[PDB]
Ligand binder design. Structure first.
Ligand code: CLA
Ligand code: CLA
Ligand code: CLA
Ligand SMILES: CCCCCCCCCCCCCCCCCC(=O)OC[C@H](CO[C@@H]1O[C@H](CO)[C@H](O)[C@H](O)[C@H]1O)OC(=O)CCCCCCCCCCCCCCCCC
Ligand SMILES: CCCCCCCCCCCCCCCCCC(=O)OC[C@H](CO[C@@H]1O[C@H](CO)[C@H](O)[C@H](O)[C@H]1O)OC(=O)CCCCCCCCCCCCCCCCC
Ligand SMILES: CCCCCCCCCCCCCCCCCC(=O)OC[C@H](CO[C@@H]1O[C@H](CO)[C@H](O)[C@H](O)[C@H]1O)OC(=O)CCCCCCCCCCCCCCCCC
Ligand SMILES: CCCCCCCCCCCCCCCCCC(=O)OC[C@H](CO[C@@H]1O[C@H](CO)[C@H](O)[C@H](O)[C@H]1O)OC(=O)CCCCCCCCCCCCCCCCC
Ligand SMILES: CCCCCCCCCCCCCCCCCC(=O)OC[C@H](CO[C@@H]1O[C@H](CO)[C@H](O)[C@H](O)[C@H]1O)OC(=O)CCCCCCCCCCCCCCCCC
Ligand SMILES: CCCCCCCCCCCCCCCC(=O)OC[C@H](COP(=O)(O)OC[C@@H](O)CO)OC(=O)CCCCCCCCCCCCCCC
Ligand SMILES: CCCCCCCCCCCCCCCC(=O)OC[C@H](COP(=O)(O)OC[C@@H](O)CO)OC(=O)CCCCCCCCCCCCCCC
Ligand SMILES: CC1=C(/C=C/C(C)=C/C=C/C(C)=C/C=C/C=C(C)/C=C/C=C(C)/C=C/C2=C(C)CCCC2(C)C)C(C)(C)CCC1
Ligand SMILES: [Fe+2]
Lengths: 108, 38, 37, 34, 37, 81, 37, 504, 188, 342
């Protein structure tokens, strides 16, 4: 069996994305659900043997699990001080890079 | 500090454009300069 | 060539025909924005 | 002559910038495993 | 009566040992620094 | 499934620090590659002829290495500008 | 609950062993596109 | 039921019948050697050792008997062409009969060692189960290898007690079986120095004996015993298959490139002698020296040995044959009858022209005549409509010096074209294409066939190393993998792969 | 290390004229850029031979022979000079049989040279040139025929003769420019 | 307290993102240099002094025509080390001498050994059977025979396939013109193996996808599966009956089908490897002598085989002058075999 709560998908902001990454669909589980092509469901969900195994391949091995991400990655530690220095460094290196490209070419 | 994350789709879009730009430059260079038969 | 009155606008015409292939990519980036829901 | 020098001189701002942003957490990794 | 080609062959053997020694040394160092249990 | 202990790539490629660091490192490596060719260093390190170096006044045809143990001397004469 | 990962690992060396030289080579090949005979 | 590809695995754990099964292959291999030699002796023609050597008649095992010292036949002839002097037991026929008699004895022993398989020798004294102490057995059978390697180089090759080995001059003109002395300096590792062969088999024999003594006394390390599965005899098969394909690659290389152990007088020239102009340079040198003695070109070329000229013929190149052009080289271009003499082509103004020799890579090659500085002067045009080099409009003539056609000169374009086509093949010889109805397409010498066979075997035996090598290591999972394995195979469940005591 | 930089952002091709000036002993011409020097010597007195990298049919050869006269007219009229040098177009000496099935050719003939232009130009200096344009056809039909451009002049007792030949297939595909350009650049 | 081997073994076989293992000590160094040697050679290194060709991006070639070309034929089978008697320590001259080819070929050949040892290493750790390593012997046999054995039987490394797209195409067309490699029964078995394996890959993939059981209510059938599911995902009985009534014969054993999917491709490459070993010695299946005798005697007997023989003569004559510059073949055009017109 597999526990979907410990698969790292619990912090997905969008419910639809959360369900898709979980391999689950409450809409398709109902026996009155109808396909866009007009086919009615047979009562199964996305996977019939789910519950027996706990989840489908989507929930068994997710490739996008934001729960296991590092909290330190949610913000830049240096803050506005780093960004201003980063912005200034970008301009300085951009000018040097352009000048070096121009100087070392047959242009003009 | 500054809290936030770059959206993944934006990273793919910008990286996708850069790759397409790089390939376009290679095809541009196929018609000019060295190797262009001109 | 285009008529002389339309000469300044020639560069715009030189990039117009590639717009339809951008719609295919625009659909792809639209689906990426919504996380391929 | 100095052609390789010039190019190698591009690393000095690069390494300094990366260290300015990674040195801290790098020490955290070093201490954790040592 | 060692020809210069013979010296380089000996030098290559020594250089090969140094490359192997450098590999083994680095692996043993990291293996000890980062050990299980 | 599970993970091997490394940080998820999606986490790093979405973090601000990664782009702040790689908004300089990746561009610099590109410029270094550009300067490696524009400054003529690519020709000199690997010996490929410049567009005006394939033929000389002495040799107007393709080079031919016709010696094994004197190939080092011979290729220097063929490459002489 | 809280995850802390190491910055430099064997995976890091592998990614940079291939990415760093590629970006350099990509820069070099791009410069070649503007060389005139 | 046992699959058809695992039938011979029944002697895997039966030491008595493993010997019996290995005695049967030994009986067959010696049986083949005797049968092959007798056939070759029934087809071999020893009348003409210079223009009809062994290697032109497709003889495969005859060179190997000759290489070690067998030179005489009970028929009274010698491979050199001299008359036999009391051949004794060890003739070509005697050696063939000996390998045949040995085949019968090994066949009989195989039956015995098969019926009487349950010997107390093959029983483990501790468990009473059939077992072989492979680390000790290897020491025994290696000590014999070292002893036999030493004796071959010290008595047989050296000449102390034995015939020696075939040694030839650099150009394969005068070669005999001689007693070679070991060369212990760096020249002992020259592949073309026959003195290295005696020195090697002596020194490797000494080390083989000492290694056999060590491997007979010192027990294997516990860690090495488990790592290499030394209790499993399939480990020995994997390493032996590995060693035998290593030797097959080496023995194919020295055959193709030539060495002191593959004389061209027994196996034919190598393809590199034609490529590098090895014989042509020697022929021109001898003619040039005779010209320096104020001898006529007609008589200087007559001095050139016909055996030397025959080596300068592209039909004796081992890289000009075909995979399914079966038979002897005589079956391809005929039996060599005589040398037609050197053909020198002259312009109408008297300048000498040289026919560009055919490289080995070309099945067919345009005939083009070059002058001293390498400029094209005449050729046989394909497009005979606006030609600028046809021999008719250049007046090319051919004159033969030495050989059968010495002095004779041809001027009509038809014959000049005919000999120009012959000239790009090297020296011009007269061939008899009626006795065996030769097709006209070249064939490979025993040098080519040996190389191809032992290269293909070497490549196939690499898979044997991998298969039998993977079988011994992965023996515990040969019938399948364990039922419940998912927990161990999980990514990140354990710090170290497989190790369940390193849980994360 | 040469030390020279790469021509990044150059903007100018060193030589886009399609011809490379060549100076010889007493003669000069503009060899096409794409043609390679050849060591082949088809005729007596050959001092220069360049063949096209693509097709070996397109080639030019410059001959210097010791006629001993001082004017090209002293070697005969333009028609007489061409007939005396018909060896330049090749020969059928290899084929000696008789035939009646070569369409468009005289009986027992498999090749034919058709002379299109016979002009006698003079140099700006004064040297007279006997220029000739002849299309040689063969029963093989190779290249759809070959265009032979021949310019000859006598200087210092030597007959300087250039022969630029171009296959017809290459001629109407654009190789005509290179051939005519080289034929009109030969100066002695 | 563990010894060096045990402490090092712990680190090498650590279950990380990219498994290193003991074989990684041989694979990753050699594989990186072989990859780096090829990328470096195709980008900056020239073949001007070895083949009289341009083969780098810096010289103006593109991905299709760039290559890491072989050394000149005068080098023979020299291993061409950086420190060898050829290009004695001079890196730039080493590149100009084609030494980068032997660099890529040698470090590349040891990478194949390292990768095959890696398959053994991981399979033993995961406790499964070693049939992926056995399958990898076939590509190694192809590489060993084509890039090592074939040039070793020829004049030198010059005739080995150069590491490039168009360079391989030249190597391919060289084999038709000079070896008649299409006619060889070993390339024929190699073709049947590769084409048969491509057929099996497609036919098996489609059969599984079209015999899938309905394990969900969504049209997207990819999601209705679990790697740990005990029940089969597709009906073998339906698959077997389908191909029995369409093709007349079908697989009834799942294990046999997958082994066949492994045997066809591997056997094909191995058989093809044997043929190239024969071409190393010019021991080629070039011609049928019986038809050549018949064709020479009867000038009206023509087959598609004889037409191919004339095509090979055209390939050899029109290609030798530039493909083999060491032979210094100056062919006047009149001697080149050419048909009517064209
Ligand atoms: C008294 C035993 C005996 C003797 C004197 C001979 C003698 C001869 N045999 Mg025969 N043979 C024998 C037994 C014997 N054989 C048996 C028992 C068999 C059955 C297997 C054969 C099968 C056989 C065949 C198939 C052939 C011969 C052939 C020959 C003739 C040429 C041998 C040769 O040059 O090959 C050279 C021998 C070698 C190159 C041996 C190489 C040794 C390898 C490389 C061992 C290296 C690994 C080693 C273990 C390293 C570790 C040791 C080291 C550390 C010291 C020669 C007259 C040939 C012949 O001419 O046909 C008539 C032939 O083709 N024999
Ligand atoms: C390493 C083993 C070896 C080697 C190198 C040679 C080498 C040679 N043998 Mg030989 N021979 C051998 C083993 C070997 N033999 C064995 C084991 C036998 C017992 C059968 C014989 C019996 C034998 C005879 C009777 C004769 C030779 C002859 C010759 C010489 C001619 C070669 C030839 O034309 O073969 C040609 C090879 C081929 C035409 C094809 C090679 C096999 C292909 C590549 C394998 C393909 C698979 C298979 C054929 C598919 C079958 C399809 C079916 C329709 C048949 C040559 C030097 C002949 C000779 O010159 O007399 C002096 C001779 O008449 N051999
Ligand atoms: C495990 C990694 C590995 C492996 C297997 C190889 C293998 C090889 N390299 Mg490579 N190389 C490597 C890593 C590796 N390399 C690295 C990291 C670099 C730096 C980037 C290079 C740079 C490099 C260059 C520049 C060249 C090679 C070359 C070669 C080839 C021949 C060189 C050789 O082995 O001669 C020497 C043989 C030995 C050293 C045998 C070693 C046996 C041990 C070590 C002996 C112990 C010595 C010790 C002192 C005991 C003394 C004994 C006493 C009798 C003296 C060979 C196939 C050459 C080549 O490509 O050919 C064209 C070449 O030019 N390599
Ligand atoms: C002593 C004479 C001159 C020394 C000059 C050193 C400082 C140069 C300043 C002028 C300048 O712009 O850089 C001129 C050069 C530019 O090239 C230099 O190359 C160096 C290589 O290590 C570094 O890459 C420098 O960053 C780079 O500026 O700077 C130098 O130092 C090169 C001087 C070479 C010798 C010149 C006299 C001979
Ligand atoms: C066990 C296997 C050993 C395999 C190698 C052993 C030596 C094989 C050849 C020995 C041999 O031919 O002997 C042949 C020799 C001499 O034998 C004579 O050779 C003459 C050569 O002209 C004649 O041909 C005679 O007919 C022949 O009888 O017999 C011996 O003296 C050998 C005795 C030593 C054997 C025991 C130790 C081995
Ligand atoms: C030159 C020197 C050559 C040495 C050749 C022998 C090497 C050792 C062979 C047996 C290996 C072994 O112990 O069991 C085989 C090894 C170890 O098997 C066991 O494993 C256990 C944990 O599961 C412990 O580590 C035990 O100590 C170990 O014996 O199995 C593996 O590690 C799988 C991959 C093995 C790859 C080959 C490793 C050896 C490679 C180089 C050795 C270098 C130096 C050794 C000193
Ligand atoms: C075992 C029992 C069952 C046997 C079944 C029969 C099997 C047959 C398979 C083919 C055997 C015959 C081959 C062709 C024979 C032939 O052409 O004509 C018959 C040829 C002889 O050919 C004749 O020879 C005569 C002189 O004796 C004359 O020269 C004739 O002109 C010539 O035609 O016989 C052979 O030469 C073949 C001997 C075997 C040679 C093997 C060389 C290669 C060895 C190993 C290759 C290893 C791996 C390859 C890849 C796998
Ligand atoms: C298992 C094997 C694992 C190891 C394999 C080999 C590993 C490394 C091999 C390289 C080490 C050197 C081996 C030879 C040692 C020796 O005896 O010296 C051999 C020669 C000795 O020096 C030469 O000797 C000649 C003969 O006497 C002449 O005297 C020459 O004048 C002299 O230069 O020098 C070298 O070849 C060493 C070159 C080192 C190059 C390192 C790699 C360079 C890579 C990139 C460079 C890029 C750009 C540079 C240019 C700009
Ligand atoms: C000889 C052996 C060769 C070793 C391999 C080469 C070593 C170098 C490889 C290291 C970097 C690999 C980078 C790709 C590896 C990588 O970054 O993948 C990352 C991604 C999932 O990884 P994450 O970092 O998200 O892992 C988070 C986990 O906790 C959730 O599963 O994989 C996928 O996108 C799904 C399958 C895509 C398969 C294609 C992979 C590329 C994805 C983008 C396209
Ligand atoms: C309605 C129109 C019919 C279309 C024609 C279909 C042709 C049928 C050909 C099948 C005969 C081959 C028998 C395989 C032997 C056989 O019957 O084995 C039967 C085998 C069944 O194996 P199982 O699954 O029962 O295996 C259980 C274990 O015991 C395995 O040993 O079926 C297959 O292996 C599938 C492979 C079929 C693909 C066959 C390869 C292609 C045929 C090649 C023909 C050569 C060309 C000849 C031209 C002269
Ligand atoms: C008993 C006895 C006897 C007799 C014996 C004998 C008679 C022996 C012989 C035997 C024999 C007579 C044997 C033989 C054998 C043969 C073989 C063994 C071979 C096989 C072959 C093979 C194996 C091959 C294969 C193949 C082919 C076919 C094709 C190609 C490829 C190959 C080459 C692979 C005596 C009197 C002594 C007395 C005592 C007892
Ligand atoms: Fe499957």
């Amino acid at each position: 069996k597999i526990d979907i709560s410990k698969q790292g998908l619990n912090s997905i902001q969008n419910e639809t994305v959360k369900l898709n990454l979980m391999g689950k669909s409450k809409t398709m589980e109902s026996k009155d659900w109808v396909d866009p092509q007009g086919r009615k469901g047979k009562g199964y969900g996305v996977y019939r043997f789910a519950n027996k195994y706990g989840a489908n391949v989507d929930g068994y091995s997710p490739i996008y699990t934001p729960d296991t991400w590092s909290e330190s990655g949610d913000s830049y530690k240096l803050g506005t001080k780093g960004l201003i220095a980063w912005a200034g460094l970008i301009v300085v290196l951009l000018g040097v890079g352009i000048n070096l490209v121009i100087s070392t070419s047959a242009l003009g | 500090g500054t809290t936030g994350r770059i959206p993944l789709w934006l990273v793919g879009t910008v990286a996708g454009v850069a790759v397409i730009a790089l390939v376009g430059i290679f095809f541009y260079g196929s018609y000019v300069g060295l190797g262009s038969s001109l | 060539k285009l008529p002389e009155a339309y000469a300044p606008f020639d560069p715009i015409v030189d990039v117009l025909p590639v717009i339809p292939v951008l719609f295919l990519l625009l659909a792809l980036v639209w689906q990426a924005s919504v996380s391929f829901r | 002559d100095n052609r390789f020098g010039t190019i190698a001189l591009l690393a000095v701002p690069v390494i300094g910038w990366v260290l300015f942003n990674i040195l801290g957490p790098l020490q955290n990794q070093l201490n954790a495993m040592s | 009566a060692a020809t210069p080609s013979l010296n380089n062959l000996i030098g290559s053997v020594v250089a090969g040992g140094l490359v192997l020694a450098a590999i083994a040394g680095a692996i043993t160092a990291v293996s000890n620094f980062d050990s299980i249990r | 499934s599970g993970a091997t202990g490394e940080r998820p790539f999606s986490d790093i490629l979405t973090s601000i620090r990664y782009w702040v660091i790689h908004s300089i490192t990746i561009p610099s490596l590109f410029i270094a590659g550009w300067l490696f060719v524009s400054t003529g260093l690519a020709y000199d390190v690997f010996g490929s002829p410049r567009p005006n170096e394939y033929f000389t006044e002495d040799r107007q045809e393709t080079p031919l290495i016709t010696d094994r143990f004197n190939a080092l001397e011979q290729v220097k004469k063929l490459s002489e500008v | 609950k809280s995850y802390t990962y190491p910055i430099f690992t064997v995976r890091w060396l592998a990614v940079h062993a291939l990415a760093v030289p590629t970006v350099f080579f990509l820069g070099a090949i791009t410069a070649m596109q503007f060389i005139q005979r | 039921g046992l699959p058809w590809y695992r039938v011979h695995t029944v002697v895997l754990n039966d030491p008595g019948r493993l010997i019996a099964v290995h005695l049967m292959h030994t009986s067959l291999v010696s049986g083949w050697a005797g049968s092959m030699a007798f056939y070759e002796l029934a087809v071999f023609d020893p009348s003409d050792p210079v223009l009809n050597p062994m290697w032109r008649q497709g003889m495969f095992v005859l060179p190997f008997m000759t290489r070690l010292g067998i030179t005489q036949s009970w028929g009274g002839w010698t491979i050199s062409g001299e008359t036999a002097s009391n051949p004794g037991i060890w003739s070509y026929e005697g050696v063939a009969a000996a390998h045949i008699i040995l085949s019968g004895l090994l066949f009989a022993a195989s039956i015995w060692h098969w019926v009487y398989w349950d010997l107390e020798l093959f029983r483990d004294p501790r468990t009473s189960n059939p077992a072989l102490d492979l680390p000790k057995i290897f020491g025994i059978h290696l000590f014999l290898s070292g002893l036999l390697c030493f004796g071959f180089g010290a008595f047989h090759v050296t000449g102390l007690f034995g015939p020696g080995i075939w040694v030839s001059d650099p150009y394969g003109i005068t070669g005999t079986v001689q007693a070679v002395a070991p060369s212990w300096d760096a020249t002992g590792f020259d592949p073309y120095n026959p003195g290295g062969i005696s020195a090697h088999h002596i020194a490797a024999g000494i080390l083989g004996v000492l290694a056999g003594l060590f491997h007979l006394c010192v027990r294997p390390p516990q860690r090495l015993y488990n790592g290499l599965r030394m209790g499993n005899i399939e480990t020995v098969l994997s390493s032996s298959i590995a060693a035998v394909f290593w030797a097959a690659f080496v023995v194919s290389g020295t055959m193709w490139y030539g060495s002191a152990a593959t004389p061209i007088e027994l196996f034919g020239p190598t393809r590199y002698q034609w490529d590098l102009g090895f014989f042509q340079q020697e022929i021109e040198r001898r003619v040039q020296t005779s010209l320096a003695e104020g001898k006529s070109a007609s008589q200087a070329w007559a001095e050139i040995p016909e055996k030397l000229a025959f080596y300068d013929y592209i039909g004796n190149n081992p890289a000009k044959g075909g995979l399914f052009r079966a038979g002897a080289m005589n079956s391809g271009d005929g039996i060599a009858v005589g040398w037609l003499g050197h053909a020198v082509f002259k312009d109408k103004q008297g300048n000498e022209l040289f026919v560009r020799r055919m490289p080995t890579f070309f099945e067919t090659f345009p005939v083009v005549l070059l002058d001293k500085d390498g400029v094209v002067r005449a050729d046989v045009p394909f497009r005979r409509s606006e030609s600028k080099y046809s021999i008719e409009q250049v007046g090319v003539s051919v004159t033969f010096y030495g050989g059968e056609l010495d002095g004779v000169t041809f001027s009509d374009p038809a014959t000049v074209k005919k000999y120009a086509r012959r000239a790009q093949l090297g020296e011009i010889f007269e061939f008899d294409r009626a006795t065996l109805q030769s097709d006209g397409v070249f064939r490979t010498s025993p040098r080519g066939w040996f190389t191809f066979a032992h290269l293909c075997f070497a490549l196939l035996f690499f898979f044997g190393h991998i298969w039998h090598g993977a079988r011994t290591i992965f023996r515990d999972v040969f019938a399948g993998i364990d039922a419940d394995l998912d927990e161990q195979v999980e990514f990140g469940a354990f710090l170290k792969l497989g190790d369940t005591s390193t849980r994360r | 290390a040469y030390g020279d930089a790469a021509r990044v952002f150059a903007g100018n091709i060193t030589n886009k004229s399609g011809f490379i000036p060549y100076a010889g002993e007493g003669f000069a011409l503009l060899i096409p850029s794409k043609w390679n020097p050849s060591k082949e010597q088809d005729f007596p007195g050959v001092v220069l031979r360049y063949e096209d990298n693509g097709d070996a049919v397109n080639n030019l050869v410059v001959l210097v022979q010791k006629v001993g006269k001082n004017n090209i007219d002293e070697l005969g009229s333009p028609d007489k000079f061409l007939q005396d040098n018909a060896y330049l177009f090749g020969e059928s000496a290899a084929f000696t049989g008789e035939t009646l099935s070569e369409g468009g050719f005289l009986p027992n003939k498999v090749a034919a040279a058709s002379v299109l232009d016979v002009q006698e130009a003079t140099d700006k200096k004064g040297k007279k040139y006997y220029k000739y344009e002849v299309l040689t056809r063969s029963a093989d039909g190779d290249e759809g025929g070959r265009h032979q451009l021949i310019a000859a002049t006598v200087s210092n007792g030597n007959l300087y003769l250039i022969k630029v030949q171009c296959g017809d297939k290459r001629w109407f595909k654009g190789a005509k420019r290179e051939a005519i350009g080289a034929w009109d650049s030969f100066t002695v | 307290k563990r010894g060096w081997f045990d402490v090092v073994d712990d680190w090498l076989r650590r279950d990380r993102f990219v498994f290193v293992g003991w074989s990684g000590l041989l694979l990753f160094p050699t594989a990186y240099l072989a990859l780096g040697g090829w990328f470096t050679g195709t980008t900056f290194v020239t073949s001007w002094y070895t083949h009289g060709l341009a083969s780098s991006y810096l010289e103006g070639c593109n991905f299709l025509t760039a290559a890491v070309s072989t050394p000149a034929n005068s080098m023979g089978h020299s291993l061409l080390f950086l420190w060898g008697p050829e290009a004695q320590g001079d890196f730039t001259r080493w590149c100009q001498l084609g030494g980068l080819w032997t660099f890529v070929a040698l470090h590349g050949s040891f990478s194949l050994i390292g990768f095959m040892l890696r398959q053994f290493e991981i399979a033993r750790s995961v406790k499964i059977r070693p049939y992926n390593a056995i399958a990898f012997s076939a590509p190694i046999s192809v590489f060993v025979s084509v890039f090592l054995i074939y040039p070793l039987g020829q004049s030198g490394w010059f005739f080995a396939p150069s590491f490039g797209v168009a360079a391989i195409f030249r190597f391919i067309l060289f084999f038709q013109g000079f070896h008649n490699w299409t006619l060889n029964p070993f390339h024929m078995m190699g073709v049947a193996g590769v084409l048969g394996a491509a057929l099996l890959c497609a036919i098996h993939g489609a059969t599984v996808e079209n015999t899938l059981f309905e394990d969900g209510d969504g049209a997207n059938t990819f999601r209705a599966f679990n790697p740990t599911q005990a029940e089969e995902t597709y009906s073998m009985v339906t698959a077997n009956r389908f191909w029995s009534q369409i093709f007349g014969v079908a697989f009834s054993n799942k294990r046999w089908l997958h082994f066949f999917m492994l045997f066809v491709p591997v056997t094909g490459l191995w058989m093809s490897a044997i043929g190239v070993v024969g071409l190393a010695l010019n021991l080629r299946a070039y011609d049928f002598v019986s038809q050549e005798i018949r064709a020479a005697e009867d000038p009206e007997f023509e087959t598609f085989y004889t037409k191919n023989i004339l095509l090979n003569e055209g390939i050899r004559a029109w290609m030798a002058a530039q493909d083999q510059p060491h032979e210094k073949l100056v062919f006047p055009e009149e001697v080149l075999p050419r048909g009517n017109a064209l």
